[PDB]
Amino acid sequence: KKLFLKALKKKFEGEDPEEKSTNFYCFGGWEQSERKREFTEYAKKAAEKRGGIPFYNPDIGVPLGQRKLMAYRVSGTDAYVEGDDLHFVNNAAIQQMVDDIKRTVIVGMDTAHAVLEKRLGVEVTPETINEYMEVINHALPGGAVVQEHMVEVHPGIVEDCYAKVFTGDDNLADELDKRILIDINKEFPEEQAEQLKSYIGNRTYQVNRVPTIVVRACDGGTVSRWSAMQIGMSFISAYKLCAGEAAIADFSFAAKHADVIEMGTIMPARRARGPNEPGGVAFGTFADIVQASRVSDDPANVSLEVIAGAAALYDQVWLGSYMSGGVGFTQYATAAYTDDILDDFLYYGMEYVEDKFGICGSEPTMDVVRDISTEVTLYSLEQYEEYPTLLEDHFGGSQRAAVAAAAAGCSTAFATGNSNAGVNGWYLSQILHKEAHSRLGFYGYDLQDQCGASNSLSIRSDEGLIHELRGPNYPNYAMNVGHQPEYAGIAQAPHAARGDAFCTNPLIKVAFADKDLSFDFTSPRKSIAKGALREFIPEGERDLIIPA
Amino acid sequence: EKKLFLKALKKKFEGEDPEEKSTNFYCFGGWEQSERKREFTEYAKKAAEKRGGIPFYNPDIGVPLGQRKLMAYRVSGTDAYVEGDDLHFVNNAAIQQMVDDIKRTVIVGMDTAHAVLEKRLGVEVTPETINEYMEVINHALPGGAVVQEHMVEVHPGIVEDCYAKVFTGDDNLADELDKRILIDINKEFPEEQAEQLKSYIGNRTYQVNRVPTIVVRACDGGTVSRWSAMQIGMSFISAYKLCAGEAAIADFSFAAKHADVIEMGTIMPARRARGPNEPGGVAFGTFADIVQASRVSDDPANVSLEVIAGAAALYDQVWLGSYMSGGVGFTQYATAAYTDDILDDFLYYGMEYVEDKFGICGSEPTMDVVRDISTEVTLYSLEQYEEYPTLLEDHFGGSQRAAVAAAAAGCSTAFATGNSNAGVNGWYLSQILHKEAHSRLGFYGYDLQDQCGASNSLSIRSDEGLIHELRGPNYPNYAMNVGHQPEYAGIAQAPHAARGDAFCTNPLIKVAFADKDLSFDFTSPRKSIAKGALREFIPEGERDLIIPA
Amino acid sequence: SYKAQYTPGETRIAENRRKHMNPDYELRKLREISDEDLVKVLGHRNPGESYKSVHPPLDEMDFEEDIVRDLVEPIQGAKEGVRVRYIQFADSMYNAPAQPYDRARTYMWRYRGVDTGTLSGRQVIEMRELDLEGVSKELVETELFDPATTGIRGATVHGHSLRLDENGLMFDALQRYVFDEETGHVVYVKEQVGRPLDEPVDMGQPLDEEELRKITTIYRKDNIAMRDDKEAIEVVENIHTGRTMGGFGMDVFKEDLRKRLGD
Amino acid sequence: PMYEDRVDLYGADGKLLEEDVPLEAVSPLKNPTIANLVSDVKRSVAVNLAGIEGSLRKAALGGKSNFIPGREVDLPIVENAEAIAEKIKKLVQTSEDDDTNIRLINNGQQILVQVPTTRMGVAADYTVSALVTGAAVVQAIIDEFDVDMFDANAVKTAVMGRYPQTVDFTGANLSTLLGPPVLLEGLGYGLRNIMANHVVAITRKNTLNASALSSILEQTAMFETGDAVGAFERMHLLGLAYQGLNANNLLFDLVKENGKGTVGTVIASLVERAIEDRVIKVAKEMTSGYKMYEPADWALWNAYAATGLLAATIVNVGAARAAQGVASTVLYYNDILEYETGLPGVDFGRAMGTAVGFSFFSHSIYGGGGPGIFHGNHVVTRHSKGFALPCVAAAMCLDAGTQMFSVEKTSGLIGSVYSEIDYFREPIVNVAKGAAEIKDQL
Amino acid sequence: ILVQVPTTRMGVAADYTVSALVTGAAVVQAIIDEFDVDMFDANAVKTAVMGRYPQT
Numbered sequence A: 001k002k003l004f005l006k007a008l009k010k011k012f013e014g015e016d017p018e019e020k021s022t023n024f025y026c027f028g029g030w031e032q033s034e035r036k037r038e039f040t041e042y043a044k045k046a047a048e049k050r051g052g053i054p055f056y057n058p059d060i061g062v063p064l065g066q067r068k069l070m071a072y073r074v075s076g077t078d079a080y081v082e083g084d085d086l087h088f089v090n091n092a093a094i095q096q097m098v099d100d101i102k103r104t105v106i107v108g109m110d111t112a113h114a115v116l117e118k119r120l121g122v123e124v125t126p127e128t129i130n131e132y133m134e135v136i137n138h139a140l141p142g143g144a145v146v147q148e149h150m151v152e153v154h155p156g157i158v159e160d161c162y163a164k165v166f167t168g169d170d171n172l173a174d175e176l177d178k179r180i181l182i183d184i185n186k187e188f189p190e191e192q193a194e195q196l197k198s199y200i201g202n203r204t205y206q207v208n209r210v211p212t213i214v215v216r217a218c219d220g221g222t223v224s225r226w227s228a229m230q231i232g233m234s235f236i237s238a239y240k241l242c243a244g245e246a247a248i249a250d251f252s253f254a255a256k257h258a259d260v261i262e263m264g265t266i267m268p269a270r271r272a273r274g275p276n277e278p279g280g281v282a283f284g285t286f287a288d289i290v291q292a293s294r295v296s297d298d299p300a301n302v303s304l305e306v307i308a309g310a311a312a313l314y315d316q317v318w319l320g321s322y323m324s325g326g327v328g329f330t331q332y333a334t335a336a337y338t339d340d341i342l343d344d345f346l347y348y349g350m351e352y353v354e355d356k357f358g359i360c361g362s363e364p365t366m367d368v369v370r371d372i373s374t375e376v377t378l379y380s381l382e383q384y385e386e387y388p389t390l391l392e393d394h395f396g397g398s399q400r401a402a403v404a405a406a407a408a409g410c411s412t413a414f415a416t417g418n419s420n421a422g423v424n425g426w427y428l429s430q431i432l433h434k435e436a437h438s439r440l441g442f443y444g445y446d447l448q449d450q451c452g453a454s455n456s457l458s459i460r461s462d463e464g465l466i467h468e469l470r471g472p473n474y475p476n477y478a479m480n481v482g483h484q485p486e487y488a489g490i491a492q493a494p495h496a497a498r499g500d501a502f503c504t505n506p507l508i509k510v511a512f513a514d515k516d517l518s519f520d521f522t523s524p525r526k527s528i529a530k531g532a533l534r535e536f537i538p539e540g541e542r543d544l545i546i547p548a
Numbered sequence B: 001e002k003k004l005f006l007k008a009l010k011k012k013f014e015g016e017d018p019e020e021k022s023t024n025f026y027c028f029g030g031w032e033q034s035e036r037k038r039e040f041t042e043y044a045k046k047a048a049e050k051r052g053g054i055p056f057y058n059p060d061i062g063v064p065l066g067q068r069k070l071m072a073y074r075v076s077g078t079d080a081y082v083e084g085d086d087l088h089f090v091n092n093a094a095i096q097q098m099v100d101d102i103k104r105t106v107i108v109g110m111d112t113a114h115a116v117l118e119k120r121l122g123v124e125v126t127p128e129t130i131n132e133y134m135e136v137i138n139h140a141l142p143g144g145a146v147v148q149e150h151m152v153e154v155h156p157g158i159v160e161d162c163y164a165k166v167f168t169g170d171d172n173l174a175d176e177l178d179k180r181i182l183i184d185i186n187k188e189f190p191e192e193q194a195e196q197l198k199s200y201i202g203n204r205t206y207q208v209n210r211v212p213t214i215v216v217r218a219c220d221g222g223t224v225s226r227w228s229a230m231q232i233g234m235s236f237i238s239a240y241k242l243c244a245g246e247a248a249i250a251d252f253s254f255a256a257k258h259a260d261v262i263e264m265g266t267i268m269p270a271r272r273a274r275g276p277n278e279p280g281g282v283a284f285g286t287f288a289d290i291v292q293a294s295r296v297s298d299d300p301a302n303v304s305l306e307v308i309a310g311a312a313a314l315y316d317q318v319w320l321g322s323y324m325s326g327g328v329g330f331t332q333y334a335t336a337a338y339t340d341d342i343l344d345d346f347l348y349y350g351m352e353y354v355e356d357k358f359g360i361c362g363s364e365p366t367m368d369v370v371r372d373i374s375t376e377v378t379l380y381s382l383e384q385y386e387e388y389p390t391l392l393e394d395h396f397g398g399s400q401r402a403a404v405a406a407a408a409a410g411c412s413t414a415f416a417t418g419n420s421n422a423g424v425n426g427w428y429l430s431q432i433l434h435k436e437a438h439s440r441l442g443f444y445g446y447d448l449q450d451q452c453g454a455s456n457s458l459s460i461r462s463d464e465g466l467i468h469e470l471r472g473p474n475y476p477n478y479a480m481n482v483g484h485q486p487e488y489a490g491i492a493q494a495p496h497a498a499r500g501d502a503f504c505t506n507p508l509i510k511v512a513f514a515d516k517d518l519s520f521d522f523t524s525p526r527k528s529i530a531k532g533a534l535r536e537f538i539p540e541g542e543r544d545l546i547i548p549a
Numbered sequence C: 001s002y003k004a005q006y007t008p009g010e011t012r013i014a015e016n017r018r019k020h021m022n023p024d025y026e027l028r029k030l031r032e033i034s035d036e037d038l039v040k041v042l043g044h045r046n047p048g049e050s051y052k053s054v055h056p057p058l059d060e061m062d063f064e065e066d067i068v069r070d071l072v073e074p075i076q077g078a079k080e081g082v083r084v085r086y087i088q089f090a091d092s093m094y095n096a097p098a099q100p101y102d103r104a105r106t107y108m109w110r111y112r113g114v115d116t117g118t119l120s121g122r123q124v125i126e127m128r129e130l131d132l133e134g135v136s137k138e139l140v141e142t143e144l145f146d147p148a149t150t151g152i153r154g155a156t157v158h159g160h161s162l163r164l165d166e167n168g169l170m171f172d173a174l175q176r177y178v179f180d181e182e183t184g185h186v187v188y189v190k191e192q193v194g195r196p197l198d199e200p201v202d203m204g205q206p207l208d209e210e211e212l213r214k215i216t217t218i219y220r221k222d223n224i225a226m227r228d229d230k231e232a233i234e235v236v237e238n239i240h241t242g243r244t245m246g247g248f249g250m251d252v253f254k255e256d257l258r259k260r261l262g263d
Numbered sequence D: 001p002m003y004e005d006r007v008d009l010y011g012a013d014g015k016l017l018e019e020d021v022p023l024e025a026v027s028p029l030k031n032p033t034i035a036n037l038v039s040d041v042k043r044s045v046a047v048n049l050a051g052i053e054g055s056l057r058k059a060a061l062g063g064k065s066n067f068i069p070g071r072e073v074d075l076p077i078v079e080n081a082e083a084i085a086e087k088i089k090k091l092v093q094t095s096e097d098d099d100t101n102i103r104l105i106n107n108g109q110q111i112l113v114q115v116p117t118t119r120m121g122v123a124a125d126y127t128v129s130a131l132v133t134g135a136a137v138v139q140a141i142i143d144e145f146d147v148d149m150f151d152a153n154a155v156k157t158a159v160m161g162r163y164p165q166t167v168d169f170t171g172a173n174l175s176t177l178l179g180p181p182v183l184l185e186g187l188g189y190g191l192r193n194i195m196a197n198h199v200v201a202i203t204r205k206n207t208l209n210a211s212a213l214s215s216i217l218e219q220t221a222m223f224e225t226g227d228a229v230g231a232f233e234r235m236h237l238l239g240l241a242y243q244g245l246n247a248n249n250l251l252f253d254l255v256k257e258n259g260k261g262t263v264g265t266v267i268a269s270l271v272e273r274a275i276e277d278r279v280i281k282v283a284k285e286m287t288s289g290y291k292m293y294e295p296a297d298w299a300l301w302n303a304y305a306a307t308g309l310l311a312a313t314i315v316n317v318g319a320a321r322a323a324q325g326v327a328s329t330v331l332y333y334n335d336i337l338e339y340e341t342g343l344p345g346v347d348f349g350r351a352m353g354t355a356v357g358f359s360f361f362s363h364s365i366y367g368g369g370g371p372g373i374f375h376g377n378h379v380v381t382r383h384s385k386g387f388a389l390p391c392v393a394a395a396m397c398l399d400a401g402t403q404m405f406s407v408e409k410t411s412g413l414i415g416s417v418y419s420e421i422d423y424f425r426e427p428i429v430n431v432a433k434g435a436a437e438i439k440d441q442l
Numbered sequence E: 001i002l003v004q005v006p007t008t009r010m011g012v013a014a015d016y017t018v019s020a021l022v023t024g025a026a027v028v029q030a031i032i033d034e035f036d037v038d039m040f041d042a043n044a045v046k047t048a049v050m051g052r053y054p055q056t
């Protein structure tokens, strides 16, 4: 059975999914939609607040809904929602996913501990780390620890702010307060735990999540600074230091520069942003943030969960607002995580790979890339050709090109274990798609796909880069929808096929293995669905400081 | 009273004599003396279940706050007395909405787009077509679709603060534009100011786009000119019935994102990287033009003080206190410049000294005049702290005292001379005189810019010389330290307020915030900040409509 | 030859500043503290313990020739590699006998191998601990110290700007010292970061108000106002003006410009 | 010449090198040693072959704690360093006769690559050296071992790091003294970007050569920023000659006569020398007897003041053998000097202001770090126009081991890679030899 | 005016911005000297030549 049929049958109730014809113009326009009706009603209720300024009006411009306006199944869920409920402005789960990433920074503790012992003659023990972690959980959300006559942040509005510690040293982990421990051996399957610890070694890290309200009022560049200020206050208080001496500057340099791990790197001037903003998150970094890898051993499922989160992050929020704005890019993104369509294509490719090569059963060669990418692209195209309702669902060429090529690229990575062979396969898929349907995506969709084969295995200046470390600022990729989310899946795919615990950074992977995050990173699909249903409670609202 | 701050001192210290040098301590019960601290402690305990064991706010960790009296503060020019915690930007929705209203605003000239329509596309532009275009963009800018089938849209109830208006220096055209979407220069500004603005603006037309508050909270300031431009393009396509993607459309884009756009703030260098429309990129004169006190008051001290109050929230509390640092932050470094009428007293003293000795705008800038005014106002300010022990216990940190004394000295010098750089030179004199009087000044790194200040105030070199109005948080000497930027914004305003100018640096910015439909009240940042401190301010961008009841 | 001037001003306050800075002016001793009690209040070590190093003896760092380095005599704590430690004071604005920039200028004239930080609320010296202890003794025994208006404190320093308590002592949120009502002495019960002392350290009797007016280095209108020291103001204004002229450059460098223009 | 000033050039040992030299003979615009030194800083690139190899062997790619499991490439790069270097030479040079220099260091684990000036001449900025060197290193490695196409991009990533996803070579295994211009604080700041610990490592901890190299780079940067133009040029030249190059032995003699002294006694010695040399004179004697001085020659007074400043740093930090005191020394040297005389301090307040922030950001929670990590392109220590950072270079030479971010920690291979370059290691003697070459041409 | 800065200045500078910076400094001083612009107006000449640098 094809995985998308269940959704088509519900989305096109009363109609044969294989029938080429239908009736239009018979739905009442916007009035067919619960959500459109709600929107129009709020627009009218807004008239008094706006004092005469015109507002949303369904009679301005395009009369939406001459065709049937679709509901969408969030893939891997049973949630069916109108597209508007998946717009990032309308979906608190998507916004909290981004805020939880922006507000996280990781700081090594071994250098600060060396400053204490070597420079300040102060001993560091499990008990003193535990006391420090208690102090920073008062200081990080805005509590005072040294000065008299301090004002403080209202704890009620920053209850999402906290700090935890993790270590590759099992002997130290057994001694740390479990209330503040991210326990690698408990969060990860045994083999993944062992892999993570071999790379992390006997090193200790704190994970600081600054308040959601702070990154909403300010930006991502605030996060490493806020973390570092309160790390400094917490060392001063917990270890009873002089509150302002030369050694303190060493904690600062360590926490803001020498021992810090941020989520995202800075942008060039044309698209200027500080750290911990979406354009700076490499694809492999995002795959490590998503936690599907540690709860599923289905490499297709793992890749698909990453693609869902990355579609929200890169296409809807980054490209659709930060870099553009407006109605934005909801359905460019939802095509990669709704109706189990991408699932059908990727499970086909994974099963083709399992049968012909074995998962991780081939070294990367052009023969293998060509074989797999071609076959999965043909299968994907044939699905749109056999199901008119499928093609009316993924109505925009860009959507189709991204989804077929995502299945082709991930499947190639499953066979070969090589992300750049994967992305080479993605570029083959795109030019084959174009030649089959005599179309591809929007006006500027294939800028990176026509340059892609040559730059996939390039070793030059701004061309060559291992795929896991490419991201939204890789030059070819810096402008266009329908690629970045899927590239995150391609970064995850060879590692999921191998059963790796992470793609690029074991510190990132452990730092999000934490039930106390607000967004559920083990399944971005399920969380986004909960947001679409208006059932997700975000952080950072201001109800406690504003009138009832 | 004899001094503008005495009323507040007497209320803040429970009737204690402001002149008495002695008191009692250690007798307040620590944090339990404060309603606000007790509230915070109780919320922290109620948070236990949500946090599932993670420790949290605990007044028994570290310093036992409240061995002295924990002060309330009068927001100056108001009757609101609030605990310091109510002025923390995280706790104060008015301060956050002030920043968001600034971040979410961009100005775009329309004359180039109109030239593309007539000259490249053969399409006529009339008042009627502009009015129809402004109606379309007020559907498109908040996330309503205008061209494509099967578009999803933003929930209008979440973005009721998003709108677009138009203004023009052409009175004949303004008479023909829809009143509902017009910022009317002749109605918003006193006659003389209106005439000045129109003389500089000329026969040009501009639209003011305020993108939704929720968008800048979810994203950043760099989103704003882009969001504006996307929906400007959609609205021209729709209102003028263009081909929905042809060569001329790229001209609208380049005009709206680059050639004809006015942003609030400029980009940062890499060490402090941020996109446009973030606080560090807002020049001091730009911020003085955003504040609207100039158009409702002709008292130059009052106008400068309202600018300083808004700028203390923006630059010290939000920019230096969070964007560039974070944590408990810098509330009281900032509140010293807008509470208890203390700065008011010093600045009203200086203005009256200037009125008597020089006249407002009565002198050309000379070193004699700067030295005379800055010295006298600094001495007077220091003497206030020496005469009133409760005043000195209020502005308990040297940095606070240095900033407030120098602000009065610098603004008063600008009042006499009409020259902002003479003002800031006076500010630097005040600092080193202050230091020699009390054998102290501010915090460890307070006076980096003040010891460099005299030489760079009138410098003409590379990264040194710059007319003061155009300096801002990225001017190199200014890039790091509290207790200066807010007061510099006042000094930027002071010579223009004394002259009765309608603006300090940009008439388009000044008109763009003369709009009752802003959420924060920019005619009195003091009043609005007070309303937030009282938890009476209703901000924009909350998510109640999309989250469970 | 050259006779140092130290600071401008025609008032008693200025002369007090000059007295502090002049290394040939002998600071009057007002009290005595034992070596043990000073070490206890400092709080870094216990008396009798070996001084602890941060690096090996200095002569193991100097195998290659540096003629300029060997021009400078290291203080004894540097020779032995002793760790760097600190003392920090808050000085009441009610005529404490020493004041923050006054201290910094005094230390930089009188003492060798100084790292000193000035703030409104406290003033810190960090020095090789061996030599710190000798310097600290002078700073607590002499007229630079008044136990009522000079508080030893490494953290939570609030109090320089506050009203005095009902016994005439400066505020201290951690109450590292208390007034002994039986004797009238100020007694330290904690060390400078706030750990309890096993044995309290008597710092003696507060100076009376009139003695403080006579020896303090702060200007206050109700004692001697800055406004009355016209000479001091004249020199401050001269420093400001000269800095303004040097930054502007075009007048003070006019002959340099003329040579560059070929005129 | 343009200016009438002449000086005697004295070495770091306090002995005369060159007598009666026109000031312009040490101008960055004229001195051939300074020109070659700046050319070498711009064209030189450190290639870490051992780091490239180990990054590849572990797939430890693209920066701090990154690993990409399954993408490891195991190659004997260091064992074949000579062959690889010969290939780099062929790819980087523009002709067999040009000034391309390739030097293996540390048993082949590192290479110093000096890109030919012909390539710099047709490039817009100095990043070309790193870019061309990186391209040659990547191709040399791929060709040496016939690295297959699907592994080749890991070699690229091992050499140049996360570029172009990052704006710079984050996590790369090559480095340059100058970082890319996209990270500059100020326009024209390229030469100011070298941390004090690197300066100390290049000069092998020799106090006055470190402060000289810093002064040379700082003041040359002042020509690049346009600050040393017109009215201000003579101030910057005199600053270089006196504070950086021990003109007339003033720097050395001030330290020598105050070796058992304090910051105050150094001030007294400098003011006395300035009065003898008629650099300053009494403007007014006040009621108390206080004499308020004025400069007779403002640029020369600033140079005398700056020289006392470096001498005070050496005396006071040298006494502690602990560099943390450097910011405090720079601050109170200027503060005391001004209230001793009524004169403006070094750089008319900007050295003092720089020291205020430097003190704060080397003792506080907010940023900065220990003294060794600062430089003229740092927001904290950019403000003085060349007169402060030489003190930090001198101070870190004199630190005997009190820092966590020591020369060894931040700059551990910088000595082995760059300090064999004579003009870098020993700038004073070599700038004096350059001055002798042109003194009669001015 | 077309100003071509000497190659000697480019040779001891790290990048090509030297030409703008030196030229700006020369223009500012040439104007201030030509008209003896007073100290309080001089920073406006600087701002006219080089714009909002260094706030931008």
Ligand code: F43
Pocket (backbone or CB within 6 Å): A062, A325, A326, A327, A328, A329, A330, A331, A332, A333, A395, A396, A397, A398, A399, A441, A442, A443, B140, B144, B145, B146, B147, B148, B149, B151, B152, B230, B231, B234, B237, B244, B245
């Ligand atoms: C005006 C443009 C030119 C332009 O610069 N952007 C437009 C419009 C822009 C608007 C449309 C909103 C509105 O209607 O008010 C937005 C939402 C961006 C914004 N400003 O918020 C958008 N497109 Ni477009 N745009 C899309 C797409 C596409 C597809 C639609 C093909 C079809 O058969 O319907 C075509 C490109 C193509 O042919 O491949 C397309 C073109 C176009 N796109 C044509 C309008 C075409 C028309 O007249 O109908 N978009 C898509 O292929 C799917 C996703 C969809 C985006 C909205 C979402 O992601 O939810 C939207 C993304």
Ligand code: F43
Pocket (backbone or CB within 6 Å): A143, A144, A145, A146, A147, A148, A150, A151, A229, A230, A233, A236, A243, A244, B063, B326, B327, B328, B329, B330, B331, B332, B333, B334, B396, B397, B398, B399, B400, B441, B442, B443, B444, C119, C120, C121, C122, C154, C155, C156, C157, C158, C159, C160, C161, D363, D364, D365, D366
């Ligand atoms: C640890 C430091 C060193 C440092 O880098 N920053 C500190 C602490 C930092 C913390 C104090 C928070 C806490 O108690 O947990 C915060 C709030 C910044 C943050 N991390 O959020 C802050 N200071 Ni501080 N800091 C201040 C100030 C000051 C004044 C206080 C003088 C006094 O007599 O009380 C002195 C500097 C001076 O002497 O001039 C000062 C020093 C210091 N400041 C000393 C601690 C002093 C002590 O041990 O008591 N601050 C002020 O002068 C007023 C504003 C106040 C800031 C909070 C606000 O603006 O509301 C706070 C601003």
Ligand SMILES: C[C@@H](OP(=O)(O)O)[C@H](NC(=O)CCCCCCS)C(=O)O
Pocket (backbone or CB within 6 Å): A225, A256, B271, B272, B320, B321, B324, B325, B479, B480, B481, B482, D361, D366, D367, D368, D369, D379, D380
């Ligand atoms: C110095 C610099 O810090 P770094 O040395 O780069 O870590 C800079 N911070 C600051 O300027 C902190 C300013 C706000 C806090 C102190 C206010 S007095 C910054 O984070 O970019």
Ligand SMILES: O=S(=O)(O)CCS
Pocket (backbone or CB within 6 Å): A442, A443, A444, B245
């Ligand atoms: O029509 S375009 O391809 O220009 C943009 C599509 S969203």
Ligand SMILES: O=S(=O)(O)CCS
Pocket (backbone or CB within 6 Å): A244, B443, B444, B445, C119, D360, D363, D364, D365
């Ligand atoms: O103590 S410091 O002056 O370093 C900073 C005060 S907030």
Ligand code: NA
Pocket (backbone or CB within 6 Å): C221, C223, C224, C225, C226, C228
């Ligand atoms: Na008096």
